[PDB]
Amino acid sequence: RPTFYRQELNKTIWEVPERYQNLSPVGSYGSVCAAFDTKTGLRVAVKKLSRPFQSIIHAKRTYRELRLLKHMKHENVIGLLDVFTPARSLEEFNDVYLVTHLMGADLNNIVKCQKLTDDHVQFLIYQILRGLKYIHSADIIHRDLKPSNLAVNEDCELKILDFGLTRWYRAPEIMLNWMHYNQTVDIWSVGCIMAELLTGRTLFPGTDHIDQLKLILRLVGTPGAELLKKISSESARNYIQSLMPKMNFANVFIGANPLAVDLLEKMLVLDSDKRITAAQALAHAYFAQYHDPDDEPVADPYDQSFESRDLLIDEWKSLTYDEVISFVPPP
Ligand SMILES: O=C(NCCN1CCOCC1)c1ccc2c(c1)C(=O)c1ccc(Nc3ccc(F)c(NC(=O)c4ccccc4)c3)cc1OC2
Ligand SMILES: CCCCCCCCO[C@@H]1O[C@H](CO)[C@@H](O)[C@H](O)[C@H]1O
Ligand SMILES: CCCCCCCCO[C@@H]1O[C@H](CO)[C@@H](O)[C@H](O)[C@H]1O
Numbered sequence: 001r002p003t004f005y006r007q008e009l010n011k012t013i014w015e016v017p018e019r020y021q022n023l024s025p026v027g028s029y030g031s032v033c034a035a036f037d038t039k040t041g042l043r044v045a046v047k048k049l050s051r052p053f054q055s056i057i058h059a060k061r062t063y064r065e066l067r068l069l070k071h072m073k074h075e076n077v078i079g080l081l082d083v084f085t086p087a088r089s090l091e092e093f094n095d096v097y098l099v100t101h102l103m104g105a106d107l108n109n110i111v112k113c114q115k116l117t118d119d120h121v122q123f124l125i126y127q128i129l130r131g132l133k134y135i136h137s138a139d140i141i142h143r144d145l146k147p148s149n150l151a152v153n154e155d156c157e158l159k160i161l162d163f164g165l166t167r168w169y170r171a172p173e174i175m176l177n178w179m180h181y182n183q184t185v186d187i188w189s190v191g192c193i194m195a196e197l198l199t200g201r202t203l204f205p206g207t208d209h210i211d212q213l214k215l216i217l218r219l220v221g222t223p224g225a226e227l228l229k230k231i232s233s234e235s236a237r238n239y240i241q242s243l244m245p246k247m248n249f250a251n252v253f254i255g256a257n258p259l260a261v262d263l264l265e266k267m268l269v270l271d272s273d274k275r276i277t278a279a280q281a282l283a284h285a286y287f288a289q290y291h292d293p294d295d296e297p298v299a300d301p302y303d304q305s306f307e308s309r310d311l312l313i314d315e316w317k318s319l320t321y322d323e324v325i326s327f328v329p330p331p
Contacts, residue, residue, distance in 0.1 A: 070083075136186070
């Protein structure tokens with residue numbers, strides 16, 4: 001057991017092992033500081049969970065995040081370097097700290113509203129898809145993928161943050177509270193991101209909810225007959241039928257690699273059942289210089305039975321505690 005020190009950060013006391021020095025807030029169910037791990041020589045992010053066992057909902061959220069982070073072992077997905085608490089027993093267990101790599105920026109920082117070269121977009125989107133293939137293979141859907149959730153370092157390596165829990169990158173069915181989401185909700189977001197890296201501007205910068213849907217339909221067309229067949233509500237279909245051709249992406253993204261355009265066309269399809277998958281997209285010719293079918297790994301199956309369980313606050317706390325106890329750092 002290491003020895004801890006206390007300091008006041010972001011309006012609370014953070015108590016962490018002495019190995020982590022120079023804690024500096026990076027921003028804000030938890031607050032994150034940059035630190036330096038003097039024991040490993042690595043720059044790390046230390047996230048202190050907020051009120052982790054205050055209620056059944058917080059307790060299950062805490063357990064969710066820890067289980068997810070402990071499962072994810074992939075170069076393009078945030079992983080756990082350490083988890084700690086200053087508690088010596090279950091009885092005293094009230095705080096949880098999660099440590100990951102400090103990547104040093106998110107994807108907005110790497111764009112600064114300027115277009116990237118095609119080669120650079122290839123690499124960035126390749127990495128996002130490789131991470132998503134991995135996440136999706138565990139039966140986990142991100143649902144809110146966006147630039148602020150993509151951490152990137154200076155060598156341009158990317159990790160996906162905040163999976164399994166601005167609307168500009170949201171799939172239209174998420175905005176419409178459709179339910180029964182497909183994993184390709186995430187592919188929608190990837191298309192929005194990729195469009196923006198290529199062009200320098202937001203693809204669908206809606207001013208509000210309905211404006212966002214209006215912008216989307218302008219690009220991709222009103223729903224076709226095969227899609228309208230899958231909608232029950234007559235009122236909803238009546239609304240849609242009272243309203244648009246699908247634009248040619250080759251004439252929308254002028255100057256882009258035609259293979260980029262064709263991949264965008266396969267991603268930004270309104271019908272989620274017809275969107276390209278992550279695995280399929282990794283085999284698209286756009287990624288020929290980076291694709292290796294033997295190094296795009298899948299996850300071990302992830303036991304998600306806890307998600308349907310309704311347990312007591314002390315049970316969730318106990319389960320989390322055990323997970324903290326059993327944690328073994330990665331090599
Ligand atoms: O170093 C950074 N800023 C320093 C100051 N800047 C200011 C100006 O110039 C220099 C850069 C910096 C700026 C932005 C970012 C990071 C680091 C980063 O590495 C970074 C690393 C981790 C992180 N979030 C985080 C940390 C620990 C966690 F456990 C989680 N949890 C999850 O991802 C999660 C996963 C599944 C479900 C729920 C949560 C997430 C968020 C991050 O945000 C991007
Ligand atoms: C007016 C905007 C129309 C949006 C239509 C979005 C269609 C999304 O696509 C749909 O997603 C559902 C999964 O969530 C699937 O069950 C449906 O099979 C699929 O067609
Ligand atoms: C003015 C209303 C326009 C709304 C357009 C799309 C709303 C789609 O709505 C969805 O249809 C699904 C398939 O029937 C249902 O399973 C979902 O419950 C429902 O949310």
